[PDB]
Amino acid sequence: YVEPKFLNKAFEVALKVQIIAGFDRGLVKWLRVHGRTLSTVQKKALYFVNRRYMQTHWANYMLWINKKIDALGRTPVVGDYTRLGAEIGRRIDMAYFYDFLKDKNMIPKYLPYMEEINRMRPADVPVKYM
Amino acid sequence: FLNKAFEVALKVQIIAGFDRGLVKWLRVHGRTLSTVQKKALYFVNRRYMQTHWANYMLWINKKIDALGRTPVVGDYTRLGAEIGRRIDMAYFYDFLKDKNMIPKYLPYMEEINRMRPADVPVKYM
């Protein structure tokens, strides 16, 4: 049984900012090559994909992050989360997911709620994680 | 473009095939899926038809013109039923699941789910 834990704010924001900057840079590179054929709303839907992907993998990422943080010995500083966040942002094969979407013609229908998330600072994108 | 009794038989069979498949697929791995997830997959079914409707028309008219004289609704119903039998969506369902990317269940989706397949909108190229 686990009681709720609240990640230190500076740590959490560091992780988010770095994961999404990486994802976004990767999308920019990918679009440079493949975005030729995409509308604006499809491009926006792929930005939403990046934020969503972080949302539904967050527990997967916190698993890994906490193991790394714990194999540290000492108490973590925000520098440790900026660093783990940047690794995740550049290690994840987002390009494959984008390629799948484009090939299957199943880039998500761009909907109003997706604009709600895309307009936030990446630092504020909400996750649901105890 | 195509007729309303035509397009109708076309949409109602295709969605029926897809839906049968998802049912089968949920039968096998629907265990750890919430309700909104499953509804998400039903929506996927409906949006997949819509994004590949054109393609469907190419194969469809084909078999439609390669038979003889003008066809009947009985023809369409069977066409779309075949179509609804050919596309194996299980791969899509598995990819989204594996990737943890069953889409967010949103109001437009519930809408499109709630309609009758007969009315689910489509678009000729």
Swiss-Prot record, chain A:
Function of the molecule: Creates a 3 um hole in the egg vitelline layer through which the sperm passes. Does not have enzyme activity. Species-specific interaction between the sperm protein lysin and the egg protein VERL exposes a basic surface on lysin that may dissociate the egg vitelline layer via electrostatic repulsion. Plays a role in ensuring species-specific fertilization.
GO biological-process terms attached to the record: single fertilization
GO cellular component entries: acrosomal lumen
Predominant location category: cytoplasm
Full-length numbering of the shown residues: 23 to 152 of 154
Keywords annotated in UniProt: Cytoplasmic vesicle, Fertilization, Signal
Name of the molecule in the record: Egg-lysin
Tissue expression per record: Sperm (at protein level).
Native source species: Haliotis rufescens
Localisation per UniProt entry: Cytoplasmic vesicle, Secretory vesicle, Acrosome lumen
Subunit and partners: Monomer. Homodimer. Molecules associate into dimers and then rapidly dissociate again. Interacts (as a monomer) with the egg vitelline layer protein VERL (via VERL repeats); each VERL chain can bind multiple copies of lysin.
Mutation effect (residue 129 to N): Impairs VERL binding
